[PDB]
Amino acid sequence: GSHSMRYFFTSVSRPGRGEPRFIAVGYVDDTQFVRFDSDAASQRMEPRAPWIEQEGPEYWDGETRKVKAHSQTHRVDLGTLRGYYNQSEAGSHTVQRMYGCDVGSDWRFLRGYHQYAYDGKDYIALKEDLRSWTAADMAAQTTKHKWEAAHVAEQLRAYLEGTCVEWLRRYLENGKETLQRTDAPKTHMTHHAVSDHEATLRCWALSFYPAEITLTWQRDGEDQTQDTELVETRPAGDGTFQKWAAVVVPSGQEQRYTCHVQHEGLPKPLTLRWE
Amino acid sequence: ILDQVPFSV
């Protein structure tokens, strides 16, 4: 919807050379504000955004004790899951978990989710109604019946519908200059001679936030999907994103091709030409 | 804020 808050957890086991590595990151929209690394030196929930640093020590001490509990839950998960499939202790396995909430224009609850994966494939996930479970394989049905008898979905819904959207509103207000901003794309176009008859036009879009953007090529006002190349959105590194779309054009008729950039910071999409 | 310590599989 309008805004969202998401957490991402990853636990990869290192059989024979240490305990499993745990990495947790927090995101509000496309901005990372908290992180934790078991291999890091701080051994604490570390801030990654300026507006989250104003939280008191009760926050960080509580968050640090929560991520270590998340890692401790994944340690027994890695051992339990290898027994569900009769897998050896010599193989390195990965456990991933993510949850969060989506809010609307009124900053009220709109959508919630809580997903779990094992070795890169879906294991179990909470449905949209936040009341049922989607077990992937037969070994995942054991977790479902275990979590249904423990009323886990009822308590997860109290977070996704409750403190997730309430603390997302708190972060949006404290970081208004950062989270509620909208950076329009800085666009331009480059020309590259490919052959005697062909030439590629590259439509650039740099320094835009959030990452959602759409680049469309048109010829004489009609969409042209053939002979077009679109790369995935790149994080620039300074909190903004980059993306470009290209098209190969016969030499001389580059005036007929137009680039179109659709972004949140543009009420009407921009049109880019070569000349 | 984070959620409670999750249940194990």
Epitope: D61, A69, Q72, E154 | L2, V5
Partner: T-cell receptor, first 111, second 111 residues
């Protein structure tokens, strides 16, 4: 203030009537709310647990939760002599990963 | 699956007293409270993991060790000014989950 507040004064209710026990809390990332019953000289016994707004009926007592105005109540139908005890209000806190208790409210039904 | 020993204990002022609390629910968190007559619960010590413990609201004169996941021994020292209280032990799945109390220990220390 404390994190969980409730009127610790002795509350009396006629036998057979409805006993209403109120409890207020300070929002510290609170999402789970519980009611404990403790008799004179024994341990607190968990009797109720509510997680979403509204009413939750179980047996003769129902738990009422309202997160907007921070307060959670407990209504007891058909007040029996066995209900005479102090009821403790429990509220969790995702801020700090804590669990807070109230001072308790002594209930004594009158025949 | 939470037990405390002894149910009643009586010691002379000037030495240390060890209150035991064994837990069987495979909980990682365990708590120690004391309850004065007519009052509420007050946190003494608590532990999140098998080799960690943190001071509560009143930790003066109270020592606590956590060597294994199931045992949480509370040793009240002679530095405590008012050791006479109703000591309650509890455990929970996590820091934000509901706690289940043991039977309790009534400690009385006289001159």
């Amino acid at each position: 203030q404390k994190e969980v507040e409730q009127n610790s004064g002795p509350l009396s209710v006629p036998e057979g009537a409805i006993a209403s026990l109120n409890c207020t809390y300070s929002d510290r990332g609170s999402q789970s709310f519980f009611w404990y019953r403790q008799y004179s000289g024994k341990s607190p016994e968990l009797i109720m647990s509510i997680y979403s707004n509204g009413d939750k009926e179980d047996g003769r007592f129902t738990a009422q939760l309202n997160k907007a105005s921070q307060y959670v109540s407990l209504l007891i139908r058909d007040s029996q002599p066995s209900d005479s005890a102090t009821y403790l209000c429990a509220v969790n806190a995702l801020l700090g990963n804590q669990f807070y208790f109230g001072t308790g409210t002594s209930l004594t039904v009158i025949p | 699956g939470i037990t405390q020993s002894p149910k009643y204990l009586f010691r002379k002022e000037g030495q240390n007293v060890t209150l035991s609390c064994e837990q069987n629910l495979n909980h990682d968190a365990m708590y120690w409270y004391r309850q004065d007559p007519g009052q509420g619960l007050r946190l003494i010590y608590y532990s999140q993991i098998v080799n960690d413990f943190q001071k509560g609201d009143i930790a003066e004169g109270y020592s606590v060790s956590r060597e294994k996941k199931e045992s949480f021994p509370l040793t009240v020292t002679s530095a405590q000014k008012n050791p006479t209280a109703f000591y309650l032990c509890a455990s929970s799945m996590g820091g934000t989950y509901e706690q289940y109390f043991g039977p309790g220990t009534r400690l009385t220390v006289t001159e």
